[PDB]
Scaffold this active site. Structure first.
Site, mmCIF file in Angstrom:
data_model
loop_
_atom_site.group_PDB
_atom_site.id
_atom_site.type_symbol
_atom_site.label_atom_id
_atom_site.label_comp_id
_atom_site.label_asym_id
_atom_site.label_seq_id
_atom_site.Cartn_x
_atom_site.Cartn_y
_atom_site.Cartn_z
ATOM 1 N N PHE D 32 0.826 -1.200 0.000
ATOM 2 C CA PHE D 32 0.000 0.000 0.000
ATOM 3 C C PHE D 32 0.865 1.255 0.000
ATOM 4 O O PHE D 32 1.849 1.333 0.738
ATOM 5 C CB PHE D 32 -0.920 -0.001 1.224
ATOM 6 C CG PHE D 32 -1.903 1.137 1.253
ATOM 7 C CD1 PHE D 32 -1.618 2.304 1.944
ATOM 8 C CD2 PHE D 32 -3.119 1.036 0.596
ATOM 9 C CE1 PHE D 32 -2.522 3.348 1.973
ATOM 10 C CE2 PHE D 32 -4.027 2.077 0.623
ATOM 11 C CZ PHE D 32 -3.728 3.234 1.312
ATOM 12 N N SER D 98 4.939 -5.150 2.440
ATOM 13 C CA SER D 98 3.831 -4.540 3.176
ATOM 14 C C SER D 98 2.581 -5.414 3.116
ATOM 15 O O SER D 98 2.518 -6.464 3.754
ATOM 16 C CB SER D 98 3.534 -3.128 2.657
ATOM 17 O OG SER D 98 2.504 -2.508 3.409
ATOM 18 N N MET D 99 1.591 -4.978 2.341
ATOM 19 C CA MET D 99 0.369 -5.754 2.155
ATOM 20 C C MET D 99 0.643 -7.047 1.395
ATOM 21 O O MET D 99 -0.046 -8.048 1.589
ATOM 22 C CB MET D 99 -0.688 -4.937 1.408
ATOM 23 C CG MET D 99 -1.344 -3.844 2.233
ATOM 24 S SD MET D 99 -2.695 -3.051 1.338
ATOM 25 C CE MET D 99 -3.731 -4.462 0.965
ATOM 26 N N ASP D 228 11.489 1.191 10.849
ATOM 27 C CA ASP D 228 10.203 1.191 10.167
ATOM 28 C C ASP D 228 9.161 1.896 11.030
ATOM 29 O O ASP D 228 8.735 1.372 12.059
ATOM 30 C CB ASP D 228 9.769 -0.245 9.857
ATOM 31 C CG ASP D 228 8.665 -0.316 8.813
ATOM 32 O OD1 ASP D 228 7.725 0.503 8.869
ATOM 33 O OD2 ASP D 228 8.742 -1.200 7.932
ATOM 34 N N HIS D 257 10.321 2.114 6.066
ATOM 35 C CA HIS D 257 9.360 1.144 5.557
ATOM 36 C C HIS D 257 9.553 0.940 4.060
ATOM 37 O O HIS D 257 9.514 -0.187 3.567
ATOM 38 C CB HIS D 257 7.925 1.589 5.848
ATOM 39 C CG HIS D 257 6.903 0.523 5.601
ATOM 40 N ND1 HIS D 257 5.549 0.782 5.568
ATOM 41 C CD2 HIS D 257 7.037 -0.805 5.378
ATOM 42 C CE1 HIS D 257 4.894 -0.341 5.333
ATOM 43 N NE2 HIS D 257 5.772 -1.319 5.213
#
Lengths: 438, 438, 438, 438
Positions: D32, D98-99, D228, D257
């Site tokens: 995302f 991430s996602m 992060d 991140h």
């Protein structure tokens, strides 16, 4: 609108393109690293002039597919060829810019000029950018080009702003020739391209086109700014002029690399002046060919001579009133009604000055087609094939199959303010219907 | 190995045939009353030279079926036609002996010459053995052949020992040119044939082949023993020589009728010499026309001279390595990838001396071209048609109805795994491909 | 997602569109120079309200194709008609914005209101923008609109920043109603439109809609801003209100032109209020039509009057206890087991009172279907047909072509959460089972 | 290039995917709110190493469709399953970010590991982000994520400039680790996504992946930035490390991140190292079992020691030439032609360094074996089954039901033109062939 040119793994390498306008096809090839939309100032002036504009996006750039293979001018030319074959363009004009000139010169050399009437090279790479012991007229050694490729792979997004500064000469042109919003779109266009294409394309800038130049037999136009950064004028156009003296040479005074936007007034002026001088010879060749098919219906005598001069004055542009004409056309002893209609039809397509008020009945009943339902049902099937048709060579070929009855009703559809097609394919229907009466 | 060539009531008529070696197919047809095993000396030299030897036994003789119907050259030719079609031989060579020379002339007359490259008549019957009033150059009246049939019907087996005695001239060649054991086996081959065949076959000897001679439009070879007791040379080969002067004429001195064994050292020498020339001419005649088509795809200049030389050198069989060609072909200034893939596809065929190595990579990449869902699947449609097509013109005509994008893709299929079809059919695609791109 | 609405040369004019949610189809038509994604704040409000949002991009704008032909409201309405017909919409509400309000009135006055339930006009162009001697209610003379087109042609990308400053009134709303990030996105969409489309669009702004207004025979909504800079409220909505008085007139106080994003709270509240006030009359005499078939299964007596109130006090919008009904419907003497599962099914859809636990048993044993594979295989056939269904009639016309025993099993899956449908589709099944008991 | 993964009313849900290079397939799944273009630095090193890079855009993000339904990892995994099956990837590698790390764990749990060789979780969500009573090692309560969704719904675009500000740590990495222009493009990728997606996706962040972790039976890589800000390492990677200790654990110090761009030089180093080891182990583990099957076809003695060594040397990648092997294999006293054709078929696969030359002749002659009409045509029956089979055991099981004469013939087909299938499926035939002849 997409044209497939290749096949990578499980995907197909498709290219984005646009086919606007009606008339002589002018194919535009963009530069690094933009899209076909970069010609929006040139495409504007080409449409108002009456030319048919065709802009396509190079592989890995713009909305086209972004493959990691085929980044040499042998592939870039093989793509241009497939496009011209798919579109079946005949007697078209290839206009290149930056990298675009590298395909115009390669295609002509490798595939010939059967479909080419004239070419143009705006800010060209020709004949050679790389400076070797063989070619002193180069711009930079290979160490320089390898410095750019690495600078792209590090951060291609941050590389763009630097490139678009030496593209337009922003320290001289921004706020005057080009706005910052206009620059932003160019960045947006570049950033929305393939990451691999941005890093592989510079390795094609130093291509040897010295073997491809002599194969230019069609009329050519060479243009280049005197303030170019990406492509120094004394290393490209100045030595391009000596390689091909047949081409007209134009130096825009104080123009940067991206002179398509900054000096749009200068470029469009020279581009149209070249086309209208190198296409005039063929653009009226149809007018004498259409005249030929039209006269092959008129019975020989005193009428055939005057009718032919009513076509000469009209095709040329001489002032002609329809009321004296159409009245005279009607009251004819030897002219059969069907020919009265064809003449009445052609005489309306060629003049926009019919006062836009009245219509004629002698033609309206001639292009009738008796009124047979089956005869009308085939006429609309022709118009369907003509509304998706573009060329005169294609409209005639299709409208030569249908019977003489369906041709008359199909001409009526266009004449009676029902259907609507370009004047170039309208002659196709006319000249095809005329061959039937022979 | 058998081939069904007809049907006889409850039984099927099958013919014993053999297939050996790889190369130019040479069909050997035996004579009375032996079988296909009589070629065991000619079938040896042909295999050592690099030919494909095919021997089949005539009906009623050898290991083939022994029916009582269809003992005439109209049926014999049909038997040969069925064998040729079933084996699907292309550009083969027909060589006959005694009775076998009648099945060569009858086939060409009735069925054509699409599958035939060259023919040969060893100790032939041509043109007419029966001595009639309109045909003075006969050998014997019908009262003679009717005497032979009667002689066989009385004692078939005792008849042979008198026939083979003159078939080989065993008062001159026994224990010298032909062994006693060699005779005994030939007798066994005779006694193991159809009883009705040995009585019906002699009536087929006086068949008029004057209606079949003019149909010959292929290189021929007329060879005959000077001391042929069974088939007089002055009543056959001499007059046959006038009917077909285009044929290479050879007389083996002191040779009997069975000169396939006694004079195998002379027959093999002549037959190989004829084949190594006549076939060599076709591999040159229909190879220079390929160059003509290839040199229409290449732009005029030194490349139309350097390729022309490198083609004429390769065609002439001048020793060279592909790795010089395949690399020099690659690094070429003008040529497009397509015409670089066509040239490479020819160099792999015209140079059998491939160092015993791999294929190439640039031809594989250029040939397929796009791989369009329908256009690539219209290349497999032509691939099914060319596998059935047998000629050069036939392959040219069909592939001329297909697009250059389909022809290139079809060439890509053949190049990967060939083949299937022959080179004369593969060139039929290459020449058709070059004919399209023009 | 795309819809072909035309054909320019060798290209097909396709329009981008989106289709979300279930319920009454609400079409959202954007304005110059944005796209269908500009309604993103309205789309989120309509999806939660329980509607079906359908946004599409105008030709040359947004993500649709960018042709050079067909820039007039007769053509814009032809596209809208094709979209409406292709999707086969019924009872659809048309909402427009700026340039999008012109397509609503033009379609409604040429193609009818068969698929239309209501219309809405936000920031209208109606009735006439051009100021001549015929009407003082015009905004500006022809000499003004020519200045706009010339400004777009000069610099298309620089024109926007001066256009978007008056679009949202950034000297009033920036940093408050709208952030600069929202402006940049609106620019990114305007830049990615068409070059010809951005200059040939302002010429359609002064289109006369005076002859299209009385054709509106559906409930309308005329909403506008009292601070609009692009479309003066006094020259548009103020006089539009007189040509259309039976339309809910709403003036958002202090709202700019881009009120879809700035005053989104004020627009959505006013838009949802209109969607309820116009569609309430149709839900009534439908919910009572649903009840009509429901009460028919109930035996005429003291129970057919009680269950009437138990339905009419839920259809209105009141709340109730699911436990009370499912125990008052369960323990009942007169009702058959099947008509218990029917009322238990109608209630389970019309009640929001979930209480967040387990799902009834008697309705499962009622809508069971005897556990018959044949009868239950027919049940999934309807579900596949009802999952692709929209209207109440469309559901009843299909669910009536099945056995009443199969409808029970089909109302089982929808109940047992093994299948999902809408509200009008679900009632279409129930009101069909009720028809099969007469 | 798109792939249909579902259906939404009138529109189809398609996903934008790319396919590049040749080798071991590496599926890169973005996070995302970016797209597949965020891997443009990892997708570079993977191509230079010899891998096949496949990037696909999640629904609602990138160039993919923007529906309003199916925003949950049960649907996301189905989307991934559809993509994998449509592309028919075998022994591929899943790398998420991430996602994207949630779609790796969910796929393996629900669909299996037949197509997966290894996985990687870069800045992962695992195991559970929501801080509950039974899960103390969370990150934030549901009151936090509900605040994010509300923050996006207010102003989606203004939200991004605050998100990317912590996504990259632009107070620490801007103008150093990541350029300003690099940020702007990432913002453009975000603003060009689905409006409903950007509001629905944050609710998928706190998904319980504890039910998916134990299902992992493949080599894994857990990498996470120490700094992060968006996804705390102490609440994910640390606890995730305990749930899967078998995974190679790597912490990049000082990485935010968005460490795919800022720390691309560290991620590429680790990811390549993991792939070049874990995949290397599988190419050795399932290669020594091939030797076991091969050394059951060879009689005991020095040949069971000389082949064993020459196999273990080849498997170890020791530089050797096939022309020594292929000749020494030929002139061998004990081995039968069949087991001489099997060995040669393995040496061509296990030695990519083939001098860039041809195939062999003795293996081609021994493999086909008889070419029995049904038995050879039962080899093309298995050839249709193995092209669909994806595993090693799967290829072994099917071919174990076929005769050794059919397996040998089937191996003859693969050897000629491979392939189609992979080496893991080709070895599945070789090991099955050796298993039969025992």
């Amino acid at each position: 609108p997409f044209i497939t040119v290749g096949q990578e793994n499980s995907t197909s390498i498709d290219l984005y393109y646009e086919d606007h306008g009606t008339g002589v096809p002018v194919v535009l090839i963009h530069g690094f690293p933009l899209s076909g939309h970069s010609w929006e100032r040139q495409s504007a002036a080409l449409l108002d002039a009456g030319y048919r504009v065709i802009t396509y996006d190079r592989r890995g750039f713009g909305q086209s597919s972004q493959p990691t293979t085929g980044y040499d001018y042998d592939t870039f030319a093989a793509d241009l060829n497939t496009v011209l074959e798919t579109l079946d363009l005949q007697d078209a004009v290839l206009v290149g810019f930056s990298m675009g000139t590298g395909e115009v010169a390669r295609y002509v050399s490798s595939y010939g000029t059967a479909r080419i009437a004239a070419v143009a090279f705006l800010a060209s790479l020709e004949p050679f950018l790389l400076k070797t012991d063989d070619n002193p007229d180069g711009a930079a050694p290979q160490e320089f080009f390898d410095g750019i490729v690495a600078a792209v792979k590090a951060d291609r997004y941050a590389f763009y702003t630097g490139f678009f500064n030496d593209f337009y000469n922003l320290d001289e042109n921004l706020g005057t020739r080009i706005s910052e919003e206009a620059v932003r779109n160019s960045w947006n266009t570049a950033a929305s391209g393939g990451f691999f294409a941005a890093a592989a394309a510079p390795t094609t800038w130093y291509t040897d086109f010295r073997a491809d130049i002599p194969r230019i037999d069609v009329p050519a136009l060479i243009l280049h700014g005197t303030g170019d950064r990406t492509l120094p004028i004394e290393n490209t156009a100045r030595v391009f002029h000596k390689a091909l003296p047949s081409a007209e040479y134009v130096e825009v005074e104080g123009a940067p690399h991206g002179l398509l936007w900054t000096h749009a007034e200068e470029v469009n002026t020279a581009l149209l002046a070249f086309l209208a001088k190198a296409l005039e010879a063929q653009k009226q060749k149809l007018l004498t060919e259409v005249e030929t098919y039209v006269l092959s219906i008129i019975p020989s005598g005193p009428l055939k001579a005057e009718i032919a001069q009513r076509l000469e004055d009209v095709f040329a542009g001489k002032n002609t009133d329809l009321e004296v004409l159409m009245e005279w056309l009607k009251t004819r002893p030897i002219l059969s009604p069907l020919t009265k209609g064809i003449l009445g039809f052609v005489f309306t397509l060629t003049v926009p000055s019919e006062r836009g008020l009245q219509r004629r009945r002698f033609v309206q009943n001639a292009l009738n087609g008796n009124g047979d339902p089956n005869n009308m049902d085939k006429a609309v099937k022709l118009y369907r094939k003509l509304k998706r048709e573009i060329t005169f060579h294609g409209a005639k070929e299709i409208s030569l199959s249908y019977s003489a009855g369906a041709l008359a009703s199909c001409m009526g559809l266009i004449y009676n303010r029902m259907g609507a097609v370009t004047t170039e394919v309208a002659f196709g229907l006319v000249c095809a219907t005329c061959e039937q009466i022979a």
